[PDB]
Amino acid sequence: HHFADLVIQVIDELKQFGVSVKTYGAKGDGVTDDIRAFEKAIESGFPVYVPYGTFMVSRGIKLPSNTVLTGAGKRNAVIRFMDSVGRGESLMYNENVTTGNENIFLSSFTLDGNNKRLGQGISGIGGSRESNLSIRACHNVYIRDIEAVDCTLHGIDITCGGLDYPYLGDGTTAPNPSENIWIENCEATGFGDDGITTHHSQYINILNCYSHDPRLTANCNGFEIDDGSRHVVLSNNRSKGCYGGIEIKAHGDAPAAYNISINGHMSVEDVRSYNFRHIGHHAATAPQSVSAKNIVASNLVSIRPNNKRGFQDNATPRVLAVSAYYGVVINGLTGYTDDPNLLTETVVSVQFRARNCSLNGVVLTGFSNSENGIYVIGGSRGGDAVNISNVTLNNSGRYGVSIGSGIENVSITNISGIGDGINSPVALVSTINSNPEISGLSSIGYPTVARVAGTDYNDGLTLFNGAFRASTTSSGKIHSEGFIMGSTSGCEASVSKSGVLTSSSSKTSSERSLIAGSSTSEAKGTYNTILGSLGAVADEQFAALISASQSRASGNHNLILSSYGINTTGSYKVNGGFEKINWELDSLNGRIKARDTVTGGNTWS
Amino acid sequence: HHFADLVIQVIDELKQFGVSVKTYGAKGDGVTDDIRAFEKAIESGFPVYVPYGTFMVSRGIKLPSNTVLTGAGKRNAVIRFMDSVGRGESLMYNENVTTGNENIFLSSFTLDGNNKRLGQGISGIGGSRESNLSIRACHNVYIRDIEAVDCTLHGIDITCGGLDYPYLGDGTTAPNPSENIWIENCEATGFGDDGITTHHSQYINILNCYSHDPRLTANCNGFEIDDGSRHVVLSNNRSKGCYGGIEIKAHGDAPAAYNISINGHMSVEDVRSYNFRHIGHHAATAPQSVSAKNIVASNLVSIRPNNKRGFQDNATPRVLAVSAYYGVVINGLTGYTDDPNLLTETVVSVQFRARNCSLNGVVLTGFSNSENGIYVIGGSRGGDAVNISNVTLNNSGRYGVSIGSGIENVSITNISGIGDGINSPVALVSTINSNPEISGLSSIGYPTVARVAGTDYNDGLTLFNGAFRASTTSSGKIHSEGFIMGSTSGCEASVSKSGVLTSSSSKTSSERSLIAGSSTSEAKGTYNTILGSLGAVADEQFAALISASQSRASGNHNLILSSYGINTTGSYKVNGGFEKINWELDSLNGRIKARDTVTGGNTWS
Amino acid sequence: HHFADLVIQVIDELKQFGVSVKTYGAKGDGVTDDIRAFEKAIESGFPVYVPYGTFMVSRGIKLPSNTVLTGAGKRNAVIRFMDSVGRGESLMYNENVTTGNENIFLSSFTLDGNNKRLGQGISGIGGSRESNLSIRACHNVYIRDIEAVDCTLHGIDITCGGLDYPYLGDGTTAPNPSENIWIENCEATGFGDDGITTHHSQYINILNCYSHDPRLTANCNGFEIDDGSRHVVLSNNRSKGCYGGIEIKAHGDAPAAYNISINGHMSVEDVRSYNFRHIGHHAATAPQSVSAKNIVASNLVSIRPNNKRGFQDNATPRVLAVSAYYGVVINGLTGYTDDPNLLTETVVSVQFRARNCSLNGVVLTGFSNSENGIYVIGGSRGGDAVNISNVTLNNSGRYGVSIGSGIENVSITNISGIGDGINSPVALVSTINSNPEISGLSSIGYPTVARVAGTDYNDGLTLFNGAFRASTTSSGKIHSEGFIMGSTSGCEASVSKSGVLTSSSSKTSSERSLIAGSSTSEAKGTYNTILGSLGAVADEQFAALISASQSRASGNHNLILSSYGINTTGSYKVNGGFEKINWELDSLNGRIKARDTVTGGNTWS
Ligand SMILES: [Ca+2]
Ligand SMILES: [Ca+2]
Ligand SMILES: [Ca+2]
Ligand SMILES: [Mg+2]
Ligand SMILES: [Mg+2]
Ligand SMILES: [Mg+2]
């Protein structure tokens, strides 16, 4: 066969793809050990091509800097560990494990870790060892159209320098991150830990990948943005049959992933479709995470979340679970199930030190045997807020939106629900705290619409907090237990239980008071009333004026009526006058007094 | 040419791409029938490669399970029906039409259905027959970089088992769905029905595809998520010159697509850019769709929607049309036109049993001859809501945001509009119902800003519904026609037309009543007034107290003033006193009474 | 070597990829001029393939219509200008520079512009000349997996016909646009102007590209959507180390880009991550841009914005800067920094004639030495609005959300902030205007929560504008300085400072008035009070009625108490009666009158 060899030599020299591994002796026959051909091709300095075949390998494939490795495609070019391979190596990884490599471009092949060779139930022997593809401390890595199957640890792992993962504590940054990574159109399945994962690395885009069906039932996630990750975008990926669809977290002795964006995701039959947390920073008596911050997640799809496989000791399913994190913004979330018995606790939870979270544009459908649709619990932390808006629930949650203890600042707006198909529905909206801000509730089939600290509202509700002002373009100070309405400039209601209506330049510093229909008037005692008056002053307890001009009521329980230009000081007296006091009804002593006459037998014509 | 043949044999055995169809006798010369070479290559068990050429085929290409078929690229590897092919077959489809196949990976070629061969104006002969690519009942199918041209039926169709589409009625699930499908970077054009479409299948991602210019003018859509579809993501696709850009629907005797996500789309010169509907479930006298639920659509672009081509009997253009569906969430929509005469009815409609829909972050520009910007019509359904927020209109709609009949629950917030360039503008916002919730309206060039059930508001408007409470951290019950403001704990306003202001522990169950500036006071008759009082009770019709302490007014039209410690029961009497009644003004009989003296000739010094 | 030549001839005729440039004499040896082989291959009418090599070229590669040009991959197939090339040509461009070409498909190679050959600090000699890839006036162009390095002008430029850019003025459309362009998985770096840019062209998708590190420090942007662009989607791109991450703009003598969608982006260490502007249309005394309209941008990430490189004469960094544009909708924005000294002016600005902008779902973290988090300045324009909602700030901005002059319509809702780590924090929210609409503020570590036109609110605030109505399902007209609450149908409060509470069919047209607890009552003078009354009319200044039925008070300062069926007209009189006036307290003259008797010595038993 010397002629064929000569023809092949001519083809090899053409280098149509770069250099083929077969040029260096690779058989790709599913039997022969091709590791030396891969090593020789890779060290040559040429782009390396992997044609059709199953290329067996007796040890891991080490990648130097400036590597181009391209195959004929998934399930065409297949790279696979031999049955005889021992423990400790990922199938493919960059050669400099501690300080990393640069410019590595991998495309279009299957990595088959042959985990089967070890028997069933086995995961990685320690740290980041034994993934199908491990990238450690590398800059500029493009991973495209790679299928990762039968993986011992992870399918694809991006991590910092070192074989072990570092545990340096919260608020740290591990040395030698990977940086500028792109993972696109990859698939990971049959893995022991996670499908696609990042650790201690930054500037990463994960796009259009599919991670599904772990071998094991521990914390086995489709996409795991783990310890030390930051500045990562995930978009248009799918996860199926995992514990977490996308998990964003850290372990207790590590910094949480931060500044992570989910630009669309579809989670199919995961346990907790979207699961954001920081272990060790959940308890009320634990310190807040200093690292768990900034997640923006949009256009999230969750389908039939369940725990049929028994992941994580039968952890309860979730469409979304947020804990520990500050600053989580969720927009456009649809959760859907056709089986009410799969998820029966809480569809969406925001708990365990999660703070400053916002949910908007949520549709939850079919969770007709779950206790809660959305359930929020806080810690009474200063500067905290939870915002929930534009939510619709279709037979999802005995309590549709439930706010528990420790929440002082909550906004709940435009919530609607259908409860007719729910097993024993209770309330569309429930709060423990007495002062939620609420508007725009609509329901059918819930026996109670809103239950606010035990009080039911079934006919519509609008609740606002703090100093209130309406139909008034400017004013001075308004107390948080005060208001000004329908007024023009210059009004104030500066103490607890004080208010101004329909007035101009009128001020009250009177605890328990009302000024209405008045101008240039002032209340400054307590229990003061000023109505339809001009230049009126009430400056003693229970003093009041009605239809009075340029008058001052300074007596205890002293009321002035229908008067101009008088100042009164009497106790328990009603007075009237015009430039001088002209009559008195004396409640204290039972005297009636006129300046002029008192007469009976009168007529009014 | 025996030498060339030997060289070729050596090349074939190298299998650089897998196996070439030319190895099995394919000519790819645009004339010779290459079907047998395709069949032999495909049955061989190797990945199949299609090099440069136009590969003619006298019958459809049947795909078995575990097929890899890769070409040299669009407009490089071209697969085409011969002129002589008859009717009934799609150009490429999976072999097991009834129960399906698995693991099919198609990349990088053109499918030319040669519809031209049949003469003009022709579509598929029946059901799912005669698309360029038909996938029926398959699991795990990746379709990438395929260009579908001159298609008889659809470009790319994903469907359940069977050549016909099943019509099993609303609320059903057809047997043998396709599942786990990825369609990426594909193009469809010159089709008879739809470019890219799904039926009775689930877990599908359609990404970065371009569907444009149908041959026909029926219901010919760019992307059609049709009968029985569910759990589909579309992202970053473009449609051009179709009827619907993305249509999400079902026919009347089928279940509507449900739980569909649009993560960005661009629609160019379609008729109805985004068109969501369920035929047969639109009429007021028809049953609600049980299947039309859950659409989350974001970052939607609509450009110059028009019906120049006369699709669907000159159906009127739309940026967005929603009907039948429950739970549609739209966020980030820009509609733009440079020709006011293309769309003259309604830019965005939410009508025909659509319910529980939300629109947020909308910009509509240039629709200066359309009657309505956004037009919503409801059905007076329980638990319904329509939420419209953060909308800006630039010369778009004589009525900017219009709410028609059957809508009881509507929130309209932060709407702004410029109407100076509009042909005869009427109102930025109009509602038929008397109780919309409205705030944050801003306009120029509209003669009326808000028209609420016939009443105009041109100077700003804030409307809220239900029980109202402001500047009060806790309270007991508030009636839906009641309020509490500026108060501390323990207050109630529990009946129609009852209210508490600036008070503590004060309760009214009095229809037509007001308590203000008071403590521990109670109104329980009707027409009751309590002002600036402590421990005051008004418990008869028209009874009242002002500046009173520890007193009870129990008479008909009985008013107490400036008093301590009295209980009165007289009809049409004003009373005052201190531990005992001390004076009376008797309106009924015209008597004035003092306990002590009545005198004239008084002075106040 | 005649045998090798014969073998090669056989391989060439197989056309496995199309036609190789090596078939036409290309060496790809990094030295030999291969331009003639490229020209001959390209003119042949076959798809052209570029295998492994560095292919040197002594002049630009001209592309005709219907070109397919595919390489072996980035850093595999490399196309490069020779050192000796002069000035004036882009490395690759379509042949018909003035009226354009169609159907051009470019994939999988590096373009190396060899800008180095000119010495350092050099950019393009004029207009659109000397980019790595220039597309002028073309329809249907797909650019995929192209790496553009060492570029003289831009990496990839899409423009209209002509070598120069046209400057036709605002509101124009340049002839011969490019149309239907797709740029995907491309990289641009080491460019003189912009990485990837569009001019005077439409229907463009830019997806998953990476633009970084310009050579120069002028207006050198990652992605520049420039002069004349429209209908462009950018999604899942990354920019790093540029001036603008994504710039959307125009120069002064050109139309601004319009109707642009950003469906997710990550900006790393740019100066102004997102920078939208129209030069020449920013000044208060300049005309508004007629073209700068419609930007919808979502899921935006900004990381460590800074100006360490000194771009644009040390322009100050921004997460987001909006100017000139109408109708900008931002949803889901996270800005993050770990270095407080990089950005010290304003994190997010909306200024310089930007109008009708909305921000929602914003998290800003780490900007602890910046003066402002969000800073908005307007122009007092009619129909303008700025909407800011669901914002959380983590040690970002001495003023968290600041509203400056010229803003009449602002909505600020659900803002929370932590200020404890800020260098001298001032206020979470500050406004210059007296009438912002505000609710849902929460903070810790800011000395003031809200400062509204100089007045501080630290204990919560709810402010609404315009006519106000609550707990009332229908009403007649309400003045913008009026209100109706807790009422049933038929009420009106039609003038400044008029209000109705807890009433039915009661109307006030009385300036400075209040009706409460009443039915069928009417106030129509001024300074009118009607309380707990039925069929009561107050129609003179300071007239009032309390606990009155079927009575009319028509006197100046005339009050009726505890009465039925009387009409009074006296000045400064309190009256009561039953079908006739029965008593009077005359404040004017100091007379007390009874119809019947006046007596002392009374008891009430
Ligand atoms: Ca894990
Ligand atoms: Ca159709
Ligand atoms: Ca530039
Ligand atoms: Mg991990
Ligand atoms: Mg159909
Ligand atoms: Mg430019």
Side-chain angles (χ1 to χ4, degrees), chain B residues 13-37:
Chain B
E13 265 176 37
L14 267 192
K15 288 169 179 154
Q16 294 201 290
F17 302 93
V19 300
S20 173
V21 288
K22 291 210 157 179
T23 302
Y24 295 83
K27 296 301 187 281
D29 59 15
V31 181
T32 309
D33 185 9
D34 291 330
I35 185 62
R36 286 295 301 131

Side-chain angles (χ1 to χ4, degrees), chain A residues 256-548:
Chain A
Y258 61 88
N259 199 45
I260 310 299
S261 156
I262 304 172
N263 191 31
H265 188 78
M266 185 199 289
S267 152
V268 181
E269 293 169 354
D270 297 316
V271 185
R272 300 199 161 195
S273 299
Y274 307 97
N275 192 200
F276 315 149
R277 58 194 183 115
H278 189 186
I279 304 163
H281 301 85
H282 293 140
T285 56
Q288 185 84 29
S289 174
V290 300
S291 54
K293 302 170 156 103
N294 295 54
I295 298 173
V296 180
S298 302
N299 298 295
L300 303 182
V301 179
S302 171
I303 300 145
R304 297 165 38 80
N306 72 93
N307 202 357
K308 285 163 157 180
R309 284 197 60 194
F311 288 99
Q312 297 271 61
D313 294 349
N314 301 302
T316 55
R318 290 283 186 281
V319 163
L320 167 69
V322 188
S323 58
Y325 273 85
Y326 158 94
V328 178
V329 179
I330 307 288
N331 196 97
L333 167 62
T334 171
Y336 184 97
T337 195
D338 56 355
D339 185 343
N341 289 306
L342 299 179
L343 186 165
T344 64
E345 178 188 52
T346 296
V347 187
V348 173
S349 53
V350 182
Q351 299 174 10
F352 296 114
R353 283 195 164 270
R355 50 169 306 159
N356 294 274
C357 293
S358 185
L359 307 164
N360 181 258
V362 181
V363 192
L364 303 175
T365 296
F367 302 90
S368 59
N369 201 22
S370 66
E371 184 70 9
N372 307 293
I374 297 166
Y375 187 23
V376 183
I377 302 170
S380 286
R381 305 166 287 263
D384 198 351
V386 56
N387 308 314
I388 303 171
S389 56
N390 301 306
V391 177
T392 185
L393 306 172
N394 197 123
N395 294 319
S396 297
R398 286 183 269 280
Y399 290 93
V401 173
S402 180
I403 315 296
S405 63
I407 296 283
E408 299 235 52
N409 287 275
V410 63
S411 179
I412 301 161
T413 66
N414 299 327
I415 314 302
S416 59
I418 297 157
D420 298 280
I422 297 170
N423 184 196
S424 310
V426 180
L428 207 228
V429 173
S430 169
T431 76
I432 292 300
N433 72 308
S434 68
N435 63 334
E437 299 191 297
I438 290 175
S439 75
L441 306 188
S442 180
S443 65
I444 186 160
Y446 281 93
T448 299
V449 183
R451 177 163 298 155
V452 180
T455 302
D456 293 357
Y457 288 92
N458 297 323
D459 307 310
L461 185 60
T462 300
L463 306 176
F464 283 100
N465 290 346
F468 183 69
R469 192 181 73 190
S471 51
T472 304
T473 64
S474 69
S475 73
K477 177 66 159 175
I478 306 174
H479 193 272
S480 65
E481 296 169 331
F483 58 78
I484 297 173
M485 303 190 56
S487 291
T488 60
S489 72
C491 296
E492 307 189 351
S494 61
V495 301
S496 182
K497 305 172 292 288
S498 68
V500 179
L501 304 170
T502 57
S503 296
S504 60
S505 311
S506 295
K507 307 188 275 107
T508 172
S509 50
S510 173
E511 188 173 3
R512 299 181 185 85
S513 61
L514 182 72
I515 300 181
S518 293
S519 60
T520 53
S521 290
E522 179 162 22
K524 44 208 216 193
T526 49
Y527 296 95
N528 293 310
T529 309
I530 304 181
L531 305 171
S533 289
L534 182 169
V537 179
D539 58 6
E540 182 55 88
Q541 63 178 41
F542 300 88
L545 306 87
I546 304 173
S547 293

